[PDB]
Amino acid sequence: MDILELSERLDLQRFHSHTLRLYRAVCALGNNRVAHALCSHVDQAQLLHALEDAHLPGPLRAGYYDLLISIHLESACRSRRSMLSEYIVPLTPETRAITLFPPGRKGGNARRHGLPGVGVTTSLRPPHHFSPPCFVAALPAAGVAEAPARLSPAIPLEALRDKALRMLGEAVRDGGQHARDPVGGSVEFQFVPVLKLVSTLLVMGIFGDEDVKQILKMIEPEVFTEELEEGLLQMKLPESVKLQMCNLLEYFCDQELQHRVESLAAFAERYVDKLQANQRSRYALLMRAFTMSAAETARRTREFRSPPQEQINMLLHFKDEADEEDCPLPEDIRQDLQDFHQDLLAHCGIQLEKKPQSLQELVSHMVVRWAQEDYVQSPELVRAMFSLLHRQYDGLGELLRALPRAYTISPSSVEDTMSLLECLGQIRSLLIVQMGPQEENLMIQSIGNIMNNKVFYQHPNLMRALGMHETVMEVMVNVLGGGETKEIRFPKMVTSCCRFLCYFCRISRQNQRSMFDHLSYLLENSGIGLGMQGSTPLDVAAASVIDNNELALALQEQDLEKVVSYLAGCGLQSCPMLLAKGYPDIGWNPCGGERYLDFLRFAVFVNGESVEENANVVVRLLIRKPECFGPALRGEGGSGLLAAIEEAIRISEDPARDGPGVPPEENRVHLGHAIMSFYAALIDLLGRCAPEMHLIQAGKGEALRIRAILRSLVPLDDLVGIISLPLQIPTLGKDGALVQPKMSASFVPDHKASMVLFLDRVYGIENQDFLLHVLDVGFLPDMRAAASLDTATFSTTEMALALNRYLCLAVLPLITKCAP
C-alpha cells in the first residue's frame, strides 16, 4: 500500500509515526547493535528517497529524518558536541600560518572579518568512526560483552551533504515562491528536518567549506557575498524553525570563537619565539655587561632569579605603559604586540550601511526584530535567542570563559594526545548509559589505556582542564547511588575508579587540591565504600590528604565527625558479610574501623609530621566515643589491651573461629589478626597524635594535658607487656622445611612496631634501668630472635626481612636516644 495514500488514513499515519518514534526510542543513546538491526529493517536508500520525496506527509518525513540523523549520526553527534567545548591547538607550522584577519591590501582591522566557518582550524578533533552495515559477516564466536561495541552504521557522507544542500536550496526557493502547499503540509514541516540535517552535518564538520559558504549565502545572501535569493530571516519563519536556525547561528559563532582562540595561539607561538630569541640576547648581554654595572645587573639577575612563569608575567607588564619602559623587551616588539592586541579587539568588535556586515550584529538585530515583532511563546526558544544575543554582545567574555579551557600541545605527541581524546570520548559516552557488564569491560580497559598514555603523564594541567577526573568521579557516584549498601555492584567498577583517581592523587599536588574540593562528599560515599576490597573511596580520600600540610590544615572537623562516627559504628557491630561468609560474629567491625583509622593517620602525618589541631579534634571525638577506645581498654568492664591481644592470638590459634569451614580470593583474614590490626592502628593514631618534643620542651599546657590523657588511656606497663609478647618465628621442620604461618593469622611485627612507635612518641625514654627492663621484656627477646634470623635460608624469608625492617625503624632510633 502506497505511503502517500497513508496520508489520508489518519489512524495509519499516527501508528506509523509512532512506529518511527519507537525505532527512535529503541535506538537511542547510541545503541549501535540495535541501530544495525534497524538498518536491516530500514534501508538507507529508502530513507534517502523519503527525504527526496516532498508529497509524503509531514509527520512521516519528520520521523524518517529523525531516524536517519539518529540511527546513523547521533552517536558521532553527541561525541563531537561533547568534545566541542575543549579547545586544544597543536604547534603546527600550519597552525603558525593562521592569522586573525585574512591578508589583503586593506588594514586588517579595516579589512572585512573573515567569512565565518572558512579557513583552517587545527583544533584536535578525532575522526568520526563508522562500521559498514553487513549481515553476511559471520556470527562473533567471542562471547557477548567481550567483543568491542559495534560502531555506528556508515553513511556516504559526501553524497548526504550534497543532497542536504540540494533540498536546502529547494526549501529556500519554495519559501520565495510562497506556494500555497508547503512540503509536508506545513512551512515548519517543510523546513525543520532540513535544518536538523544541516545542524548535524555542520557540527560533524563533514560539511565542506565551499558548501558552508553556500549555506551562508542562503542564510543571508547580501551579507556573506565575498568580493533573487532572500535571507532566511527575511523570509520569516515559525517559532520552531527560528529555534533551529538559531542553533545554526550558534554553531557558526562557536566555530568563529574557536578560530579566534587558534589565532591567539598562533600569535603566542610567534611571540614566544621572539621572546626566546630576545631573552637569549639579553642573557648574552648580561654575561657581557655584568662587568660594567652591578646595580642594574643585580636587578636584571633578580629578574632571571625569578621563576620562569613570573618572568613571563613581568615581561608581559607593558600594557599599562607606566612600567613599559621597565620591561626589558624593546619598544619595537612591544609595538607589534600592541598591534596584535588592537587586532584582537577589532575582531572581537570591542574597539570602536544599515545591513550590519557583521554576523554578531546581524544576529543581535534578528533577535531584537523577533522580540519586536512578537512575544516568544516557547521558553526554550527565548532562552536560546537571549543566550545567543548576550554571547554576540560579549565576545571578549566568551574568550575569558574559554581561555582556561584552551591549551597548547607540542606537535610530536599529537597522535598520542588524539588517542587520549578518543579515550575520554569513550568515557563521556558511558556516562549517559545505565551501567551494564559490556560497559564495565569497556571503561575498565579505557581507563587502562588512559594510564598507559604517556601524554597522560606529561601535561597534568592539561588533564585538569579536560576534566576526566571529574567525569570519573561522576560515573563513580552514578554507580554508587543505586543500592550500594545492599549490594556493592561491580567492585571492578569501584576498584578501577580508585586506581584512576588514586593514581591522580599520586600525580600532582594541584590535582590533590582539585579532588580535595570534593573530599567531603567523597567521604560521605566512602562511608560504606571502604568495605569493598583493598583500594576503596576511603583509600582515594586518604591519598588526597597526604603530602600537603595545607590540605591537612584544610581538613574539616565535621568531616572528622563523620569519620569518627563511622569508626564508632564499626565498633557497634561486626560487618554482616562476615556472617554471610560464615565467618563467626564479633561484637564490632575491626576491618572498617582499621581503614578509617589509617585514613586518619595519613591525615595526621604529612611528611611524618603531626597536625596538632587535627590531633586535638580527634582526641575530642575519641573522648566522646568510648567505642573509639574500643572493647579492649573499655575502662569499666574494660578488657585489658594485653588480654585482648592474647585472646586474639588464641582465636587465631582456634580453627574455624576465624573460618566458616563449609579460599579462592584468600582475602579472608583471621579475626584475631584483624582486631589486633585495628588496635595497632588505634595505637598508631594515638602515638602520632602525641605532641612534639618541641612545644613539649617549652611545654604547652594543653599539649602536656593531651599527652597525660594519652598515657592514662594507655598504661606504660600494659605496653611493656605488649612489647614483651613473643612473636612466632618461622622454623625449619618435617625434614627441615621451614614452617611459616599465614600472615592473615599471624601476630605481626608491624603491630609490634606500632606499639613501639607509640612508646617512643608518648612515653619516650626517661631512665636507663627502665630502658634496660623494657629491652629485656620486649627488645632483647626480639634481638635474640634477630640474631637467630641471620641464616642463609632465613635471610630469604620475607618475614625475617620484615623483622629487620621494623627493628631498625624503631629499635635503632631507640638506641640512638638511649645511648647516653
Binding site: A37, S40, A45, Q46, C134, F135, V136, A137, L139
Partner: protein, 107 residues
C-alpha cells in the same frame, strides 16, 4: 544444507579461487521473501576474501561453486546459517536463509 541454482548463466570457464577476494552484490531475504539486506541498496558491492570465514561459512562455500557473471539463488540451512542462536534482531533463531549472489569481479 546449501542449495544452489542459477537464474542467469555465467562464463563457467572462470571460478572463484580459494584465498582470493571477491566483490559481489547480493540481496538477503528470509524464506517468506521479506528482504532484510541488499548490497544494491548499499550501492557498493560487498567484498569478501575466500577462506577468511568473515562470511557465514555456509554461505561462503555456496559462493565458490558459482561461476563469475552467474546470477545465483542460494538457500542456507540454519546449521550452515546463523543457526539456533541466529542473529539478534535481523535473523530469527534457527531459520533457513535465502540469498541471490552476483559475482561481479574478483580482485
Amino acid at each position: 544444507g546449501v542449495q544452489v541454482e542459477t537464474i542467469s548463466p555465467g562464463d563457467g570457464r572462470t571460478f572463484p579461487k580459494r584465498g582470493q577476494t571477491c566483490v559481489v552484490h547480493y540481496t538477503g531475504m528470509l524464506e517468506d521473501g521479506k528482504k532484510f539486506d541488499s548490497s544494491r541498496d548499499r550501492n557498493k558491492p560487498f567484498k569478501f576474501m575466500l577462506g577468511k570465514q568473515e562470511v557465514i561459512r555456509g554461505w561462503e562455500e555456496g559462493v565458490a561453486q558459482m561461476s563469475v557473471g552467474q546470477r545465483a539463488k542460494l538457500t542456507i540451512s540454519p546449521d550452515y546459517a546463523y543457526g539456533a542462536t541466529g542473529h539478534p534482531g535481523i535473523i530469527p533463531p534457527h531459520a533457513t536463509l535465502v540469498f541471490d549472489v552476483e559475482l561481479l569481479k574478483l580482485e
